[PDB]
Design a protein around this ligand. Sequence first.
Ligand SMILES: [Ca+2]
Ligand SMILES: [Ca+2]
Ligand SMILES: [Ca+2]
Length: 212
Amino acid sequence: SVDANKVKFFFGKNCTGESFEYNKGETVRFNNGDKWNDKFMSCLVGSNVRCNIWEHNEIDTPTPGKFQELAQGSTNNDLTSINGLSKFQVLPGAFQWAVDVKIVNKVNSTAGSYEMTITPYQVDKVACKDGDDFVQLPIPKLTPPDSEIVSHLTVRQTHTPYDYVVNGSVYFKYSPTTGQVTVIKKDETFPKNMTVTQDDNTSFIFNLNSEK
Ligand SMILES: [Ca+2]
Ligand SMILES: [Ca+2]
Ligand SMILES: [Ca+2]
């Protein structure tokens, strides 16, 4: 059986062919240059976890790709309507949606010595050091989705001089229309020394262009 707290995916309708298992609060990419990215046919999604699948994380481009929000507490004997899912997100009942975040040096030619800490509206604050892989920032029940969640971004060198590099605020927003996340940043809250580019749908890459 499927656990109410985990998910599982099989390469054959009615659970046949091959088997796979995924814990809550994880993200994977299953693709090999557009062919066997699918690797699914029957899956089960526990009554206290959700799945979110995204073709090629389309950025509201002039072609909508393929996307499905596997309803928390359901079984899918076939999803071939949405063969398009080169990215997979598996999230607990505690977390409504989650966002890929990463840090890149555009001035500090050292890495690891630069540590960024982000904390959205009373969430589990997350700190990552420039050189680790993409961090995941889960967000709890955020209803209505089109609301703007207040968030705080602060980045500080872990090595002398270790002053606050920048300290400011940011705003995140969600859209269930295509499971898109969008970030709103203004000179009144966000600094002019870091910027964040939308590398993909639900994927944000912060680059530091001024140590001040
Ligand atoms: Ca594909
Ligand atoms: Ca989109
Ligand atoms: Ca299929």
